[PDB]
Design an enzyme around this catalytic site. Structure first.
Site, mmCIF file in Angstrom:
data_model
loop_
_atom_site.group_PDB
_atom_site.id
_atom_site.type_symbol
_atom_site.label_atom_id
_atom_site.label_comp_id
_atom_site.label_asym_id
_atom_site.label_seq_id
_atom_site.Cartn_x
_atom_site.Cartn_y
_atom_site.Cartn_z
ATOM 1 N N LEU A 23 0.885 -1.248 0.040
ATOM 2 C CA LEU A 23 0.147 0.017 -0.135
ATOM 3 C C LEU A 23 1.049 1.308 0.115
ATOM 4 O O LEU A 23 1.980 1.167 0.728
ATOM 5 C CB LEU A 23 -0.817 -0.136 1.315
ATOM 6 N N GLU A 30 -8.455 3.513 8.150
ATOM 7 C CA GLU A 30 -8.965 3.096 6.755
ATOM 8 C C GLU A 30 -9.017 1.554 6.895
ATOM 9 O O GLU A 30 -9.849 0.828 6.471
ATOM 10 C CB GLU A 30 -8.196 3.476 5.468
HETATM 11 N N1 LIG Z 1 -5.262 0.076 -1.942
HETATM 12 C C1 LIG Z 1 -5.976 -1.115 -2.052
HETATM 13 O O1 LIG Z 1 -7.030 -1.352 -1.417
HETATM 14 C C2 LIG Z 1 -5.201 -2.469 -2.112
HETATM 15 C C3 LIG Z 1 -3.958 -2.589 -2.877
HETATM 16 N N2 LIG Z 1 -3.405 -3.536 -3.294
HETATM 17 C C4 LIG Z 1 -2.132 -3.274 -3.773
HETATM 18 O O2 LIG Z 1 -2.028 -4.123 -5.113
HETATM 19 C C5 LIG Z 1 -0.748 -4.468 -5.303
HETATM 20 C C6 LIG Z 1 -0.619 -5.839 -5.832
HETATM 21 O O3 LIG Z 1 -1.526 -6.027 -7.026
HETATM 22 P P1 LIG Z 1 -0.964 -6.973 -8.193
HETATM 23 O O4 LIG Z 1 0.420 -6.851 -8.343
HETATM 24 O O5 LIG Z 1 -1.734 -6.594 -9.470
HETATM 25 O O6 LIG Z 1 -1.215 -8.476 -7.745
HETATM 26 P P2 LIG Z 1 -2.577 -9.221 -7.273
HETATM 27 O O7 LIG Z 1 -2.569 -9.082 -5.713
HETATM 28 O O8 LIG Z 1 -3.456 -8.811 -8.258
HETATM 29 O O9 LIG Z 1 -1.925 -10.910 -7.520
HETATM 30 C C7 LIG Z 1 -1.798 -11.119 -8.956
HETATM 31 C C8 LIG Z 1 -1.713 -12.637 -8.942
HETATM 32 O O10 LIG Z 1 -2.701 -13.116 -8.811
HETATM 33 C C9 LIG Z 1 -2.901 -14.464 -9.681
HETATM 34 N N3 LIG Z 1 -3.866 -14.191 -10.461
HETATM 35 C C10 LIG Z 1 -4.202 -13.246 -11.119
HETATM 36 N N4 LIG Z 1 -5.360 -13.457 -11.983
HETATM 37 C C11 LIG Z 1 -5.911 -14.504 -11.675
HETATM 38 C C12 LIG Z 1 -6.896 -15.637 -12.152
HETATM 39 N N5 LIG Z 1 -7.999 -15.060 -12.939
HETATM 40 N N6 LIG Z 1 -6.840 -16.877 -11.801
HETATM 41 C C13 LIG Z 1 -6.085 -17.323 -10.738
HETATM 42 N N7 LIG Z 1 -5.214 -16.470 -10.559
HETATM 43 C C14 LIG Z 1 -4.676 -15.147 -10.926
HETATM 44 C C15 LIG Z 1 -1.323 -14.318 -10.408
HETATM 45 O O11 LIG Z 1 -0.725 -15.038 -9.513
HETATM 46 P P3 LIG Z 1 0.472 -16.160 -9.913
HETATM 47 O O12 LIG Z 1 1.485 -15.408 -10.567
HETATM 48 O O13 LIG Z 1 0.682 -16.871 -8.615
HETATM 49 O O14 LIG Z 1 -0.089 -16.974 -10.785
HETATM 50 C C16 LIG Z 1 -1.140 -12.913 -10.348
HETATM 51 O O15 LIG Z 1 0.237 -12.969 -10.461
HETATM 52 C C17 LIG Z 1 0.005 -4.249 -4.224
HETATM 53 O O16 LIG Z 1 0.796 -3.063 -4.227
HETATM 54 C C18 LIG Z 1 -0.961 -4.104 -3.176
HETATM 55 O O17 LIG Z 1 -0.511 -3.247 -1.818
HETATM 56 C C19 LIG Z 1 -3.919 -4.841 -2.930
HETATM 57 C C20 LIG Z 1 -5.120 -4.823 -2.143
HETATM 58 C C21 LIG Z 1 -5.805 -3.604 -1.606
HETATM 59 C C1 LIG Z 2 -0.895 -5.311 3.157
HETATM 60 O O1 LIG Z 2 -2.254 -5.256 3.026
HETATM 61 C C2 LIG Z 2 -3.164 -5.489 3.861
HETATM 62 C C3 LIG Z 2 -2.841 -5.594 5.266
HETATM 63 C C4 LIG Z 2 -3.492 -6.160 6.214
HETATM 64 C C5 LIG Z 2 -3.281 -6.186 7.655
HETATM 65 C C6 LIG Z 2 -4.062 -6.604 8.551
HETATM 66 C C7 LIG Z 2 -3.428 -6.657 9.887
HETATM 67 C C8 LIG Z 2 -2.240 -6.091 10.279
HETATM 68 C C9 LIG Z 2 -1.604 -5.340 9.366
HETATM 69 C C10 LIG Z 2 -2.069 -5.326 7.958
HETATM 70 C C11 LIG Z 2 -4.840 -6.350 6.025
HETATM 71 C C12 LIG Z 2 -5.315 -6.252 4.322
HETATM 72 C C13 LIG Z 2 -4.290 -5.824 3.574
HETATM 73 C C14 LIG Z 2 -4.927 -5.773 2.146
HETATM 74 C C15 LIG Z 2 -5.419 -6.903 1.738
HETATM 75 C C16 LIG Z 2 -5.954 -4.670 1.736
HETATM 76 C C17 LIG Z 2 -6.869 -4.204 1.782
HETATM 77 C C18 LIG Z 2 -7.732 -3.012 1.547
HETATM 78 C C19 LIG Z 2 -7.808 -1.825 2.595
HETATM 79 C C20 LIG Z 2 -6.770 -1.730 3.430
HETATM 80 N N1 LIG Z 2 -8.785 -0.944 2.337
HETATM 81 C C21 LIG Z 2 -9.883 -0.915 1.528
HETATM 82 N N2 LIG Z 2 -10.763 -0.095 1.539
HETATM 83 N N3 LIG Z 2 -9.827 -2.158 0.847
HETATM 84 C C22 LIG Z 2 -8.785 -3.184 0.829
HETATM 85 N N4 LIG Z 2 -8.997 -4.138 -0.022
#
Ligand SMILES: NC(=O)C1=CN([C@@H]2O[C@H](COP(=O)(O)OP(=O)(O)OC[C@H]3O[C@@H](n4cnc5c(N)ncnc54)[C@H](OP(=O)(O)O)[C@@H]3O)[C@@H](O)[C@H]2O)C=CC1
Ligand SMILES: COc1cc(-c2ccccc2)ccc1[C@@H](C)C#Cc1c(C)nc(N)nc1N
Ligand SMILES: [Cl-]
Ligand SMILES: [Cl-]
Ligand SMILES: [Cl-]
Length: 225
Positions: A23, A30
């Site tokens: 993140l 949040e």
């Molecule tokens: N701000 C927010 O709310 C959130 C932000 N994030 C951020 O997003 C970033 C990560 O995103 P990203 O790099 O795109 O990676 P993802 O978390 O989307 O993971 C991608 C992996 O998922 C697997 N995958 C993707 N599509 C499929 C499918 N259709 N079926 C099966 N497996 C699949 C593949 O794994 P493999 O390579 O093993 O096959 C791929 O490399 C991080 O920076 C994270 O912090 C994450 C969650 C929440």
């Molecule tokens: C590093 O990213 C995480 C850390 C944690 C986490 C939990 C406990 C303690 C520290 C980090 C939980 C969820 C996440 C990821 C999966 C997320 C998220 C997420 C968040 C943080 N906010 C919103 N609105 N949507 C989301 N999908």
């Protein structure tokens, strides 16, 4: 039968969500919202599912995964089948789409899943625009003297606004009942765009909890036998 809801925190105006596998911010209020929304259910006999991509799984601190009180599903193309239990609280799937179908079977889930949350990351969200019924989007804005963080992963805002409309007027009613939010519904203009939701401030940022819902669709075809 189970609603599918993407949940994400995004920095306006580009809707950036990640940088170098993590993140781009650390906001406890949040995280609290994310935790409470995905954990809590209206029906106490049910749990929610959280589905995430492999890279997102790897980003969660090891002491805090699998996410407690939620069924965790990790998807990776290198996994075995559509939905396999690998450890307590952890399922593996080699298909986002097939895993959702499997999770929808009332035979498999005994109607004890309330909602399915798609919790990231970028690649997963890209594939989820045609899958989610709603999006819970926390819209984040740096306050005036706050440096915009560096980001390399973005929500697809074009695809979002094509398929969904801003339904934030109904956010409070959409969230599990026992959740409590501090702010009142607010509409604010920011760098052109209308930002509507429940506001919070933390560290250098202001953010709004918002709800997006699928736009009405015309009736083109209904399958008949
Ligand atoms: N701000 C927010 O709310 C959130 C932000 N994030 C951020 O997003 C970033 C990560 O995103 P990203 O790099 O795109 O990676 P993802 O978390 O989307 O993971 C991608 C992996 O998922 C697997 N995958 C993707 N599509 C499929 C499918 N259709 N079926 C099966 N497996 C699949 C593949 O794994 P493999 O390579 O093993 O096959 C791929 O490399 C991080 O920076 C994270 O912090 C994450 C969650 C929440
Ligand atoms: C590093 O990213 C995480 C850390 C944690 C986490 C939990 C406990 C303690 C520290 C980090 C939980 C969820 C996440 C990821 C999966 C997320 C998220 C997420 C968040 C943080 N906010 C919103 N609105 N949507 C989301 N999908
Ligand atoms: Cl959590
Ligand atoms: Cl898939
Ligand atoms: Cl694919």
């Amino acid at each position: 039968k189970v609603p599918v809801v993407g949940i994400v925190a995004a920095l306006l105006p580009e809707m950036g969500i990640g940088f170098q596998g993590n993140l781009p911010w650390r906001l406890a209020k949040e995280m609290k919202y994310f935790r409470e929304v995905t954990t809590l259910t209206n029906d106490n006999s049910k749990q929610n599912v959280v589905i995430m991509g492999r890279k997102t799984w790897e980003s969660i601190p090891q002491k805090f995964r699998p996410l407690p009180k939620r069924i965790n599903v990790v998807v990776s193309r290198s996994f075995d089948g559509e939905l396999r239990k690998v450890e307590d609280g952890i399922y593996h799937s080699n298909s986002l789409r097939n895993c959702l179908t499997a999770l929808q079977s009332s035979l498999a889930n005994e109607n004890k899943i309330e909602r399915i949350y798609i919790i990231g990351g970028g690649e997963i969200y890209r594939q989820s625009m045609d899958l989610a019924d709603h999006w819970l989007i926390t819209k984040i804005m740096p306050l005036p003297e706050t440096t915009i963080p560096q980001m390399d992963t973005f929500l697809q805002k074009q695809e979002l606004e094509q398929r969904f409309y801003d339904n934030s007027d109904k956010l409070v009613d959409f969230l599990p009942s026992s959740i409590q939010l501090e702010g009142r519904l607010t509409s604010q203009e920011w760098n052109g765009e209308l930002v509507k939701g429940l506001p919070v401030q933390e560290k250098g940022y202001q953010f709004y909890f918002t709800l997006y819902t699928k736009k009405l669709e015309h009736h083109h075809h209904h399958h008949h036998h």
